[PDB]
């Protein structure tokens, strides 16, 4: 079903951490604001409402999360390990890492910036967008990637995870190393 | 081989000790609106497991919080009150925690009896024949 004004009141602690673990909710109110962390793991939610503002971290592991609307703000990280998301929207305010391990993700917006590690492990993504800048480590193990973008910035160590890299970026400033 | 009994009773006694400490924390934190980092305490419960395929030892496989909703109280003048003046408190129920205290202690002591009785049986086997 949906989340009402009083439905969410039963899933909030003293610090405004909303816990929806395995709750049979399919959507959240439009323009939703959560003071603390949001947990929607293992939920049938297919799309996040537009204007969602999270003061903490996002956790949607093993959930049905497939669509995210632009303009969403996350102060912490977005943990989506094992979700059903297919495409990442542009303009998401994210202050942590994007964990997309075990996801059907295919495309990423151009000039994407991740303030932490990016994990696209076991994803059918074909090509990292040009201008992609990562301030942490890069995980591409088990993915369909075989060609890197011409320019990318990975402040951490790039981990290949087994896939063969045929083309390397021309302009790459790496603070670490490259591991298979 | 009664030495296996020692492993099973020892694993059971360890499991009961984990359950007792979980009950001890619930009774002590049944009135705490705050927490260490940022999340209101929720009644914890150890998970016992039997890896049946001789003897099957019982192993604790992690602590899982109770899924009961937090008891909301109307404390509008409290510093931590929400927009509606409600503060949330742990879902610890006194009656079930007392039963755990009784059940864990009685289960702990009967496993000592089995190990002590099994210890004697090994000794009588050593004295067999002489």
């Amino acid at each position: 079903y949906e989340l009402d004004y009083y439905s969410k009141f039963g899933h909030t602690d003293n610090y405004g951490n909303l816990d929806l673990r395995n709750k049979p909710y399919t959507q959240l109110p439009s323009g939703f604001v959560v003071k603390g962390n949001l947990n929607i793991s293992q939920t049938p939610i297919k799309k996040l409402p537009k204007g969602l503002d999270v003061g903490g971290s996002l956790e949607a592991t093993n959930s049905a999360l497939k669509t995210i609307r632009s303009g969403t703000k996350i102060k912490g990280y977005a943990n989506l390990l094992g979700s059903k998301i297919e495409s990442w929207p542009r303009g998401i305010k994210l202050g942590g890492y994007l964990n997309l391990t075990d996801t059907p993700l295919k495309t990423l917006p151009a000039k994407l910036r991740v303030k932490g590690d990016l994990s696209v492990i076991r994803t059918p993504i074909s090509a990292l967008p040009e201008g992609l800048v990562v301030d942490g480590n890069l995980y591409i193990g088990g993915s369909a990637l075989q060609v890197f973008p011409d320019t990318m910035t990975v402040k951490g160590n790039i981990f290949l995870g087994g896939n063969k890299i045929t083309k390397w970026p021309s302009n790459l400033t790496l603070g670490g190393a490259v591991a298979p | 081989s009664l030495f296996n009994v020692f492993n099973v009773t020892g694993s059971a006694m360890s499991a009961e000790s984990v359950r007792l400490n979980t009950t001890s924390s619930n009774l002590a934190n049944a009135d705490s609106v705050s927490s260490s980092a940022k999340d209101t305490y929720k009644a914890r419960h150890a998970v016992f497991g039997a890896e049946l395929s001789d003897t099957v030892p019982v192993k604790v496989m992690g602590i899982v919080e109770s899924d009961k909703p937090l008891s909301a109280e109307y404390n509008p003048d409290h510093p931590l009150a929400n927009e509606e003046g409600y503060i949330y408190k742990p879902n610890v129920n006194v009656m079930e925690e007392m039963a755990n205290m009784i059940s864990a202690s009685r289960a702990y002591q009967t496993n000592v009896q089995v190990a002590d009785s099994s210890k004697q049986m090994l000794l009588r086997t050593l004295q067999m024949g002489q």
Binding site: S57, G76, G95, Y97, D117 | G62, I63
Partner: peptide, 23 residues
């Protein structure tokens, strides 16, 4: 492993970018 099991380590949180970013 059991789902929803608690962890015995401080809970990575928000303030101090340090946690929000490092996996």
């Amino acid at each position: 492993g059991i789902p929803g099991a608690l962890s015995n380590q401080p809970p990575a949180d928000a303030s101090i970018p340090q946690d929000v970013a490092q996996m």
